[PDB]
Every structure is written in structure tokens, then in C-alpha cells.
Amino acid sequence: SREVIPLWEDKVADGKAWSTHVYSALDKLGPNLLDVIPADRSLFCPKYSSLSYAQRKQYWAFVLSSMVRFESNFKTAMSYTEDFNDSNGNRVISRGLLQISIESGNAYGCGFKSTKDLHDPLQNLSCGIRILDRWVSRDGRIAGKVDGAWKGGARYWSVLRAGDKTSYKSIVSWSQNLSICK
């Protein structure tokens, strides 16, 4: 039985299916994510190195749900025009649960064929897993600005970037107080 349940099961009707999808997608798209022992575990999840494979999947589903909370408040339809440009000089449009954009997302191999695909919560969450799989495993840590460079998921998502703000503070607090982490 699960020890940790993601926050979207509290908020959205389809949240249990989102979890089912994320556990599957972590197996397939997050194998490197699930092998990292992150250097900032003392902040995010003090007992991380003791977690089983299944527990690490529960952990990452929960953290993803806390990112979704502050990126989109669980609104898969969300579409937000940013103040920075894509490769054509057009304003980037961030989409869906994790506020991913189509050009940047597809660079990770997410294979969005239409902008509408980013509003499919399952495709959106899969892409988030690909992004984490790349940076958390490359950088060996979940977040943080280290020696002048943002690391891990903080490379992509503002809510993972340390600052005196509700999103980051909540994500860290909720993570480190998970029973499996504490």
C-alpha cells in the first residue's frame, strides 16, 4: 500500500488516474531520476537514500503534484504567455499542468504534435518526468543555485528556485515532512 499520496488526488476528479499514469511513466521515462541520490536530500528528503524504488516513485509523484499546485493550480487548460521568446522571436506560451512550452518540451523528446497535446495532463506530466530525468540525474540534485548555475528541476521551473516565496517554501516544507522522508 502507498505511504504517500499526491496532492492532485485531493483536488481533481481524475487525480487517481494521473497518479497511475505517473507511476507508469516514471518506470519508462524516469529511470535515471529514480537512480539519483540527490546532493540536496538533506533539504528535500533527509531519508531519501533509504527509500525503495516504489517509495521513490511515490516521492516523485508527490513532488510533481506540489509543482503542479503552484504552476497551474491543477488546471490542465492553463495557457500563459511569457515575457521571453522562442526561436522565432515569438512570445513563449506555457501550457498545462507543469507550464511546459512546445518548443522547449519537444527538445526533451516529449513529442508534442500539436499545442493541444500539452493540455493533455498525461502528456504534460510525462514531459515533466523527462525534464527531471535529464537535469536531476545530470546535476545530481533536485534544485538549488550552485556556483552561479541553477540545477536539477530549478533549471526549468521557477517554483523550484529558492526564494522567499510561497511556492518554493511550500514545496520544500511538504517534501521534507513526508513520513518516508522524515
Residue numbers in the entry: 73 to 254
Tell me, in the authors' exact words, what the paper reports:
We were able to successfully purify the enzymatic domain of DslA by omitting the lipobox and ~35 aa region of low complexity/disorder, fusing region R74-K254 to maltose-binding protein (later cleaved). This construct yielded two independent crystal forms, diffracting to 1.26 and 1.36 Å resolution. Attempts to solve these via molecular replacement with “conventional” lysozyme structures failed, indicating potential divergence from the superfamily fold.Table. All four of our DslA structures (two wild-type, E143Q, E154Q) are highly similar, other than a relatively small flexation of the β1–2 hairpin in the E154Q variant. The secondary structure elements create a classical two-lobed architecture, with helix E and β1–2 sat below a pronounced active-site cleft (measuring ~25 Å across, ~15 Å deep). Partial activity for HEWL against the GlcNAc-deacetylase-treated material was indicative of our in vitro prior deacetylation of E. coli PG not running to completion, and illustrative of the difficulties of reconstituting B. bacteriovorus activities in vitro outside of the bdelloplast. Despite this, DslA was clearly inactive against native, acetylated peptidoglycan, but displayed strong activity against the deacetylated material; this level of activity was on a similar scale to that of HEWL and mutanolysin with their known substrates. Of the six saccharide rings, GlcNAc “c” and “e” sit with the 2′-NAc groups facing inward. These two positions are occupied in DslA by Y228 and M150, the former placing the sidechain OH in the same position as an acetyl oxygen. Hence, specificity of DslA for GlcN over GlcNAc presumably arises via steric blockage of ring c and e if the sugar groups are acetylated.
Here, we discover a family of Bdellovibrio proteins that define a new subgrouping of the lysozyme superfamily and demonstrate that they possess outright specificity for deacetylated peptidoglycan. We solve the structure of family member Bd0314 (that we named DslA), revealing adaptations to the lysozyme fold that sterically restrict the active-site cleft into only accepting polymers deacetylated at the GlcNAc positions. We determine a role for DslA in B. bacteriovorus exit from the prey cell and demonstrate that exogenously added enzyme is able to prematurely liberate predators from prey bdelloplasts before completion of the predatory lifecycle. The architecture of DslA is related to, but significantly different from, other members of the lysozyme superfamily but still fulfil the inclusion criteria for the lysozyme superfamily noted by Monzingo et al. — conservation of the β-sheet floor and helices D and F, with appropriate placement of acidic catalytic residues.
